[PDB]
């Protein structure tokens, strides 16, 4: 009975590019981290067993990490407009996701949810094809995402790469 | 592995 998570979070800088962090969780224990202010901004193993992998690995997943910086930077400017907020604000945006795998290697539960400034914003229900929206400005996101089929895209990771890479990670001891 | 870039809001 096992579990996997990622928490990617940014916080806006008034006028510059924000501060981004991502951390991996395996069975509730942190095994990896990213940070944009370290002088060697990169993905780091935060646990012994993860040291095995060759760098091509680290550099790839690091390439992924930049994407979120311009993503977060963009969508913090989006949410700002929805709520009619001033530009000088310093806000925080969070992406939490992952899946829960059984003992037999099947999928039990998938997670995809977002939060704006610390309060829950939008979340993926357990039928995994429907969203629950928090506020009226979150019904827009849901509106766009549901008609255009957001879930199907996200199921790709959860059904595929999530369970595969969870297995690979657990292959120590 | 981290997921890629999600959808625009």
């Amino acid at each position, epitope marked *: 009975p096992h579990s996997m998570r990622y928490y990617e979070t940014a916080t806006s800088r008034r006028g510059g590019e924000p501060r981004y962090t991502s951390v991996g969780y395996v069975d509730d224990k942190e095994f990896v981290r990213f940070d944009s202010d370290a002088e060697n901004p990169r993905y780091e193993p935060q646990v012994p067993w993860m040291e095995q992998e060759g760098p091509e690995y680290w550099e790839r997943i690091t390439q992924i990490a930049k994407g979120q910086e*311009q993503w977060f930077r963009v969508n913090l400017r989006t949410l700002l407009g929805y709520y009619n907020q001033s530009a000088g604000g310093t806000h925080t945006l969070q992406w939490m996701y992952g899946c829960d795998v059984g003992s037999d290697g099947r999928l039990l539960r998938g997670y995809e949810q977002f939060a704006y400034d610390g309060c829950d914003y939008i979340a993926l229900n357990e039928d995994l094809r429907t969203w629950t929206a928090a506020d009226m400005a979150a019904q827009i996101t849901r509106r766009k995402w549901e008609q*255009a089929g957001a879930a*199907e*895209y996200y199921r*790709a990771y959860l059904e595929g790469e999530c369970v595969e890479w969870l297995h690979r990670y657990l292959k120590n001891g | 592995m981290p997921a*890629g870039r999600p959808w*625009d809001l």
Partner: T-cell receptor
Amino acid sequence: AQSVTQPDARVTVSEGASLQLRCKYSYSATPYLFWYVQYPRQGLQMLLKYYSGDPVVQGVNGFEAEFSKSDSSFHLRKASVHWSDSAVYFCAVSAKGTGSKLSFGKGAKLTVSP
Amino acid sequence: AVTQSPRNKVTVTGGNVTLSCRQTNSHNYMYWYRQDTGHGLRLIHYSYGAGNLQIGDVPDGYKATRTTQEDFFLLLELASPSQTSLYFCASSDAPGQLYFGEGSKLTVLE
């Protein structure tokens, strides 16, 4: 790295007749697959999309496509073809890390014989 | 609803031509394609958000500027007969789901 190949840039089909336009794409890893259509004197518009799940994605107007991971393809099918369907059909791909960068197929002109 | 301008423009080898695209929509992705017989649609440049610019597959002799989220321009400071084509703007809010302009047909003369 990423190519898209459409075999026949020329097809001619009687009404009602079955049709199969073909799209074979370049390898790996997790490709995102589409079919676009360009009307006479117009621009393109999305026809079908596939992200994950059931390999057969159906269109409301009778088009449907099937993605085969093994055969590595995204083929467009219609049981009965109508004259209004006379148009150009592009198939498109994009992968992880390149999610917003589409690679368009060659294009294929469809002549529905009246 | 994506609109691009000019719809038709004629120029000569060595000229300067600018194509405009406006999307009143809230799409943060904008695109520039060129359609040809014998080569289909090839991407030139694209952008993710106002001010961002990103490279396509055949950006040679092409430049682009994203002034706003809605405006996207294709800059041809130098004209050559190889760039004689039919050009399309696009916008997207979702991966791979695109809305196209009406096309700009260019004629570059020797």
